[PDB]
Amino acid sequence: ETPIFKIKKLTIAENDRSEYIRYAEKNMHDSIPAEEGTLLIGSGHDDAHGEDNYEIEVFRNKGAEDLHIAGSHADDFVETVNKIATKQKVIDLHPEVITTKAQDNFVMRLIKVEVKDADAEKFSHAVKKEMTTSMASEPGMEIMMSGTNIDNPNEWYFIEVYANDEAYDIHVKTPHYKEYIEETDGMVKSRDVKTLVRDTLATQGAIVLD
Template sequence: MTKLEYPPLFRLYELEIKPEKKAEFVALGQRNLSLSIKTEPQTLALHATHSDEKGLENLIFELYQDTAAQKRHQASPQFQKYATFAKNAIVNRKVVDLIPELLLEKFDFLGKGTPDKITVKLAKLQLEKASAAAFKAAVFSEMHQAIVLEPGVLAMYAATVQNRPDEWIFLEFYQDKQAYAKHRETPHFKEYIKKTTDLVAKKELLDLTADTLVSQGNLNYERGGK
């Protein structure tokens, strides 16, 4: 993997969609993301998912090399068409600015498209005060081992919420449910749980359904890494 020297721009959009607008919203989103990843080298990854059965609670994760790359994406024709439609499709909108902590992808992550049975997991953690350093060391060790040792682990992102360093967000991609189950039984995952159980004050786990996932692949960034 080629390490990024500077932290990329990472942002989460939480969007509630009108039921009657859902199908067109997903279609325009797919077009926007698919064209953008092919024509914008500095757009690193774009992931559109939803968390509810009806597909109305959307979570969209965006990674850009920098602010300039995001602005180029937002000026593209495909994004402009999507954004124009989205104005009348979105009921509620929340933007969460994230600070990348560790971003790891397999070399060919999504290189052959989105696997039919891909499993996407989101975790939101609130740490106990003064536990950030110990937690970071444990989670970095676990993620590095997972991406190297487990074929079914496709990508793992860890970030903190801007201006809230005790709030962590994890976005993880597995080949399928079986790969996720195997991951939870590995020695490195169990060691991570052992070391961090007392460091976490609150945890929320969500199963996400993939709508459109795209990435340049081979993403590798570590905050404070060598």
Template sequence: MIGLKKLIMVGVIMATTLQAAPIVRFFELTTNPQKRTNYSQVGVENLTTSIKNEKGTLAMYTSRKKDDPNVSYVVEIYENEDAYKIHANSPQFKKFSEMAKTTLIGRKVFETNPQFLAEKPEALYVEKNKDYQVNLAEVTVLPEKNKEFKDIVTDEMKQSMQKEEGVIVMYAVTLKEDPNKWFFFEIYKNNDAYLRHRETPHFKNYIEKTKDMATDKKVMELEGDTLVNKGGLYLEF
């Protein structure tokens, strides 16, 4: 079991209720182009209703590839397994699940271990606001450098959240089946905030110190569809 190194919760869920690492679920979904509009509508209802009504549903995001809007990426965070079961049995999720059976033509699930999860204190509630910059990065790290990489990138993300007003969300997870493969999900207030982030000393320090630690790096700039969370999540593992 992953230990909680540092935990701060602001808002609905208090720190004392989180006894273990939350569940972070990550999906790549491909939609039938002819049914994408209906899929989007039902998906928005699922995410927004869940974040409002389910105490243990902490964050839900769906974003699309800019060059292929039929491919979307979904990130979900639940307080624990019981919280996920409550969501899975909710009317809005059952409606979405039934619709997905005839709408989705591709589905990949990534089982992850959270490494760093941080949000601004204010709850986020965004629907189809193209101003927000959403990034999904994938980094494969040399096994012998994984611990050192984690320390460096965690420090960079902590400084980003503390010092940059335009950095809204920063999550880092690793694959359960491959702990050397990292995924980073980031939300910025807008593209200018992202560009400013790339010019900060802490980001440049991260790039310099880790330049020889990774065997592969990919960054996708996504179009945010529905981006909602309760706000205030801060977990370091």
């Protein structure tokens, strides 16, 4: 049925991040490829606010998510996070487009975009065109995922992983990106970007759900 796409903002003292990363790495390693329904597990910390970790999970469906949650490695991760995190916030997303390539210099960006209610459908189509062409044409684009907040359909979250800074620079200069920014001008009310330092990232190969 509908895939599960969640982002967990976990505020953890920079002093406790090594313990966090150990359990984050075990969670990733023991989940992929062992769990058939686990499509992506990863985590990155805000380059500007090192205490903020953004843990990203994608499952085939709710059932797959539950199977993951029942795993010992998932128990260990949540126990660890509950023990050390001063704040936690879970963002549940309705997946729109989820694209990945299979598997140091990686650039990871988390973008929150508020879209005007009247432009929901037009925006969705525009961003799908851009993401699909980027994944088909840019070898430096590793992961591109989009979803809308279940609690507010006009709030979009994007996760973009680029191979390096060069891939990022190229991405904004393509013909398809130019089209995207013209088409969506006036549809976007606000855009908040967090540049994350990748700590963990794994996927169950090349995924293309649009």
